[PDB]
Symmetry: D3
Subunit: 162 residues, 6 copies
Amino acid sequence: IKFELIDVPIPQGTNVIIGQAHFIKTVEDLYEALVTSVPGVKFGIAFCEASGKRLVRHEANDEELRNLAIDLCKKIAAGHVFVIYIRNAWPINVLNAIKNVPEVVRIFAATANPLKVIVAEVEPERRGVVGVVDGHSPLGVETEKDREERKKFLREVVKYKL
Amino acid sequence: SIKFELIDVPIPQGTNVIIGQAHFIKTVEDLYEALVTSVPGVKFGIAFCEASGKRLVRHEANDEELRNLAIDLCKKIAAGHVFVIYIRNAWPINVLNAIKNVPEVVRIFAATANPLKVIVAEVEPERRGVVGVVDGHSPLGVETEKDREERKKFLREVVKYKL
Amino acid sequence: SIKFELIDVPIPQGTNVIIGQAHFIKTVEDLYEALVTSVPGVKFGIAFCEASGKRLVRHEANDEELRNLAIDLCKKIAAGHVFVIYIRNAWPINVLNAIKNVPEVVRIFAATANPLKVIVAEVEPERRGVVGVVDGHSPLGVETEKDREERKKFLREVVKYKL
Amino acid sequence: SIKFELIDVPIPQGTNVIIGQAHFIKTVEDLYEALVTSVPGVKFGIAFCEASGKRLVRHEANDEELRNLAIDLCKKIAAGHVFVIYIRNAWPINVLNAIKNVPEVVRIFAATANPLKVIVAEVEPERRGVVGVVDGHSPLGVETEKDREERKKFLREVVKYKL
Amino acid sequence: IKFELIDVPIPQGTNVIIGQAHFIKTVEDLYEALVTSVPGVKFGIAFCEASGKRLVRHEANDEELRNLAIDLCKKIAAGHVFVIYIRNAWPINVLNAIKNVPEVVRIFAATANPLKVIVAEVEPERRGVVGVVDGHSPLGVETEKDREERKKFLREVVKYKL
Amino acid sequence: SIKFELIDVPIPQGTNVIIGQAHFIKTVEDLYEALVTSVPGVKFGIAFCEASGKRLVRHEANDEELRNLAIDLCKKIAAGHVFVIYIRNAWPINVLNAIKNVPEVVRIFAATANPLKVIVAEVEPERRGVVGVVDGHSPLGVETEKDREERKKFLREVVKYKL
Ligand SMILES: Nc1ncnc2c1ncn2[C@@H]1O[C@H](CO)[C@@H](O)[C@H]1O
Ligand SMILES: Nc1ncnc2c1ncn2[C@@H]1O[C@H](CO)[C@@H](O)[C@H]1O
Ligand SMILES: Nc1ncnc2c1ncn2[C@@H]1O[C@H](CO)[C@@H](O)[C@H]1O
Ligand SMILES: Nc1ncnc2c1ncn2[C@@H]1O[C@H](CO)[C@@H](O)[C@H]1O
Ligand SMILES: Nc1ncnc2c1ncn2[C@@H]1O[C@H](CO)[C@@H](O)[C@H]1O
Ligand SMILES: Nc1ncnc2c1ncn2[C@@H]1O[C@H](CO)[C@@H](O)[C@H]1O
């Protein structure tokens, strides 16, 4: 076993969702999950066909997001992984829909942080995803006042709680 | 320190395998029920590695070949709370969302009929877990627009899962 | 270039732990609500590893013991976006599905009261990922038709989860 | 040649009722399982109108008071494929998502402790269907910013379902 | 407000599923829910487009079942109602997928019993479903002997329980 | 006997209406969060008829036009535990599955921008429930292969929801 670290580019205003699925129908099912989630949303989806032609398959509505999706696919280089990049939507806007796509088996990351995918290579052409490093270690525990500012952020800034 | 081990997963033609991790003894009867209620003709085996107490591989089936594949696989992986399902006469897409929703199922590793290996970490004597999976082969290149059009044709005219 | 470290998870009698990965600071509030609306008189603590900005283990609880258990285990794992929940007077099967459905939550690694280690990779300093769990111990043998009866009756007559 | 009839629904203090439509005789063990696996020490009784064959009200319970209250609603409503559940030590919120996901359940009409009526149509003798429910009473006015602040306080400080 | 009783034709070997949805996309989404549930299923699905062209939209893989579908729509004749007829699958095989189709708002019946739909016409051309009459009323309460024999059945015959 | 009323539902260009039944007072807050966290732009107004105690129509909103539409329809329906949502900059399919999953939500009556009528049954003074809706118009005929081609191209070329 060889462990390789695959660094994920996230231009600002993007988020990436990286996970695993199966069956070629994953790329059309994911295009439809995203496109029926948020009017407006801009995305690229790529999926690593793990057999047959073994082609990186893709759908997008934005060209920059299609190339990003497709190059992470080629960098990860691991059968059945999929990569989504989104603009004009947050992951929480589309997560549950992705989760319920019957091809989707698991999701490794949903984020905009600094992000590494840990890949095992066990033999040439035989790769899998072993984990992610989504952002950074803690610096401390939150205090009573860090709490207030997080509660006030949710209610006053992004308005997701009352 | 930590030992990594690679398990080759037997996939007789016409089978698919679903590997996951769950908890609690009720896993095995709840998976059994997920499966049987999903596709009228479904043939399956299911095995679950009980991680405490007696620590037996619990199983159910309506096929003996598939029951046996499932138990061997759990004997090879030998990781607490891991389960193994082998299926004939259903595709994983037919069954997978009902597995996800089984209250004991925390996680699913793989669902495939490709060449497949499991990465198991064994950290101590008799203390193993799944690190991950190698599902088929890495990519040979990028789909062209003409590639897209045969896969679209495949989905609409061959398997008819699309209009 | 990768260090694997093993984090042993304390589970005092009567508590189960749930470990997974999420994203976004609303994670702590949504998790709290999923816990408290699931079972009356559940007690629990939940801690979340905010992966950037101030970088704080964020927490909620209605039990002081179970709170510090969770804050502590996040302090030790030290991996961005990991959440840990400890619960009494609730089984993980009474709360898990709600947990799966929290939009922030992306994966669950373990729900258990077994002996448990989390294997963590560190790639640079400060930069850590949960790679897997070792939930309990490996199988000691296959179940026989008598051990099957034991397990069926225990579900029927003792915990009363099946008819 | 349609008559409607109103069925009043007894709800003793500390119970809630759930009434729905389903199908197939497994409805009753599936709803059994859905309830007990949701909350430790929930008390309940569940009844279901089998609409073909021997046409028997089918039932399961861990409380005889709740089980008779459920059978009696079934016998009144007297509509094929309807189910009634009465529960103590659990709120409809602790259990509704699992009920909705039971593959036999097609709709839920009410989950409530309020005063309740079921509107039933009878199209022929022995042929009946639920048309509606009357759950509690019609509004008296519109919430003021002050009523709002007291409802914010009730969910945060009293019940603790929000933060 | 006139109430009108529609009798639903159920051929030996079919089941019927009748609900309410919205938006034209309903018909493709229902077709995909069905065909990705059970490999062998034959079905017909029809949807009552409630605006615009206002037409019965259908998809099928069985002409008989396709027509049974269109025929019950034409009778209920109520905006946004959909009808599905299935051979070689049971409702439990598909129901949850159908629940989670974003266009689907309610399901009124899933069954193979003698069945009536109650339709309210409030205005000409303005109709909606008010209920169903799914088979017949209870003839008695289960005994424990009856309970044993239903449990034996689920366990030994349909094999859905252990 | 029973009094059936017809409530004509106003739907401005650009809005849609979602009408349903829930229970418990936390329904207004949970509906609010299900909307704000489904789509970044979404403008809406939510109202809910509490059906016991104070019996107030409870409301949350970020659009004063749409708050007023939802409160006014609740006042017109005047049926305990019914809820109304008006939304702009989001289609029902964007938010619906989320609504279906709010533990309080028992059922959904309608999701539409079509001419819409709610049929209410008043059964004694102040006891009202929803018996049905009339969502747009009955069929003008049956789709041909010409119109199916046009429909398939509408989904794939105009809205881009299909491929
Ligand atoms: N026709 C099909 N319908 C559904 N799933 C399929 C089909 N063909 C293959 N699969 C699944 O997709 C994987 C990759 O092709 C296979 O290993 C199998 O698991
Ligand atoms: N306002 C927001 N709404 C939804 N998700 C967000 C928001 N801000 C940040 N996130 C997500 O959470 C992570 C920050 O914790 C980001 O990388 C991003 O994925
Ligand atoms: N009575 C019970 N109900 C639900 N879950 C349980 C019960 N007993 C044990 N478990 C779970 O199953 C695991 C043992 O297989 C335990 O670690 C615990 O998490
Ligand atoms: N073995 C079975 N599996 C699934 N559904 C069934 C079965 N038998 C009957 N049904 C359904 O249950 C209804 C009768 O309760 C039938 O009309 C049919 O819809
Ligand atoms: N482009 C679209 N995307 C999503 N939903 C739509 C669209 N157009 C119409 N609808 C919904 O479908 C109903 C029209 O049948 C409308 O009333 C509206 O609720
Ligand atoms: N604290 C509570 N938690 C959950 N559900 C509640 C609570 N109080 C009341 N309810 C439910 O809501 C109704 C009050 O509208 C009651 O009939 C009951 O169903």
